[PDB]
Design a protein around this ligand. Structure first.
Ligand code: C0T
Ligand code: TYD
Ligand code: CL
Length: 379
């Protein structure tokens, strides 16, 4: 009954955080839990868990650069359109997974997991499960449909699969990220699960901060877009914000915001803060379209505007749904203006719809319940 469970994540905070509730779900159910990730191992440790860094010195941004340089045709074609069918993006996602393989396979041999839980980007997790000979459970991201994505990714890792004597298995269960209404007409892949936001711990101070008298709007762009494309995209958003009669809080995480210089007087900045803690006191949020941020805004019950850098192809899958369900607005960073921010804060139908989608979401099975379901499925 007592298991060793290995959680496997691609080297991204947006990849890793959606595994944390399940990892604490397994730990509080008495199991041993270990995380495999690269680049962000210290953040995983700051969730109170044990971590092995399966690729020391990894840099996602350097991997991205190497892909573009090495695949100029892909870069000038497929990469000029949104990443929707990830089968087409196998070359890029395989480049991301490749450096994690050797370290993950060694870890599987040493740790001997009974179960692998991996996030949807981490084909290396399926390979790990096959190495150990154990079931794999997939945790989905945003609204991407899996289809043949793992076969396409694996087609570029063939050499490594041969060396480690592994084939690509199918997961025994898949767990959706979004609530049913935000998948539109796309067929669900497995179980729905409530989104319980995780963004790190925090000392809030000597008291619980009160909700401000004036409405505050958060501006956040996740953990990879501005790192990969530069901080420039947030400038037109901040300029538009300075023209709006509302207060704004800029939350770009560990990103150095020095290049922005002096912010408008109605815009304040914070360093890394768990997003749900920030949003507890906000009226709306402007962001890039990251799935974790979309879901955390829904947990807060607030309208959202998705305005990524126009070059970023990985923020597309929530956009149609945010639109069609009326819980927010969609644009691009360079097209944000004061009128659009006023719509975000003023259109009551957006807030009504957000609250309705939140009600749907918070009734879904919890991570604790989902741990029980997984254990039943594999027993
Ligand atoms: C801006 O630059 C990018 O976005 N980069 C990339 C991301 C990748 C794959 C995603 S699709 S597989 S999950 C079916 C990538 O494989 C690799 C990597 C390492 C870090 C990263 C991020 C990228 O996605 C991020 O994933 C989050 C889970 C999403 N929220 O749910 C975010 O919306 C999205 O921003 C390749 C990549 O280039
Ligand atoms: C920048 C920032 C992000 N976050 C969280 C919100 C999300 O859970 C996660 C970002 O994931 P996500 O929004 O999926 O996008 P990306 O992969 O593009 O970064 O990081 C914080 O909690 N605090 C912060 O200061
Ligand atoms: Cl959070």
């Amino acid at each position: 009954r007592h298991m060793r469970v290995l959680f496997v994540s691609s080297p991204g905070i947006g990849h890793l955080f959606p595994l944390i509730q399940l990892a604490w779900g397994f730990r509080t159910a008495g199991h041993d839990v270990l995380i495999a990730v690269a680049e962000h191992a210290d953040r995983a440790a700051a969730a109170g868990l044990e971590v092995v860094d399966v690729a020391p010195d990894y840099s996602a941004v350097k991997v991205f650069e190497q892909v573009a340089k090495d695949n100029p045709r892909f870069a000038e074609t497929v990469a000029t359109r949104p990443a929707i069918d990830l089968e087409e993006w196998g070359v890029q996602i395989a480049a991301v997974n490749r450096p994690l393989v050797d370290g993950t396979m060694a870890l599987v041999d040493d740790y001997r997991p009974d179960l692998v839980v991996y996030e949807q980007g981490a084909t290396v997790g399926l390979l790990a499960a096959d190495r150990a000979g154990v079931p794999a459970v997939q945790r989905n991201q945003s609204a991407w449909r899996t289809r043949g994505m793992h076969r396409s990714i694996a087609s570029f890792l063939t050499d490594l699969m041969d060396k480690h004597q592994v084939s690509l298995p199918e997961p025994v269960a898949t767990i959706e990220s979004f609530p049913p209404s935000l998948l539109l007409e796309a067929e669900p892949e497995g179980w729905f699960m409530r989104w319980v936001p995780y963004g790190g711990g925090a000392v809030l101070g000597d008291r619980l901060p009160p909700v401000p008298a004036r409405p505050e709007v958060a501006i956040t762009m996740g953990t990879i877009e501005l790192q990969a494309f530069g901080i420039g995209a947030v400038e037109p958003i901040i300029a538009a914000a300075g023209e709006v009669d509302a207060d704004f809080v800029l939350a770009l995480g560990d990103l150095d915001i020095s290049p922005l210089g002096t912010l408008p007087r109605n815009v304040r900045a914070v360093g890394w803060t768990p997003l749900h803690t920030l949003l507890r006191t906000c009226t709306a949020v402007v962001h890039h379209g990251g799935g974790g941020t979309v879901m955390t805004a829904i947990d807060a019950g607030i309208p959202q505007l998705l305005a990524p850098d126009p070059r970023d192809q990985f923020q597309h899958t929530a956009r149609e749904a945010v639109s069609r369900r009326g819980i927010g607005l969609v644009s691009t960073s360079d097209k944000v203006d004061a009128d659009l921010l006023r719509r975000l804060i003023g259109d009551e139908s957006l807030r009504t719809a957000a609250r309705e989608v939140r009600e749907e979401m918070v009734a879904l099975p919890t991570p604790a319940e989902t741990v029980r379901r997984i254990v039943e499925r594999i027993s």
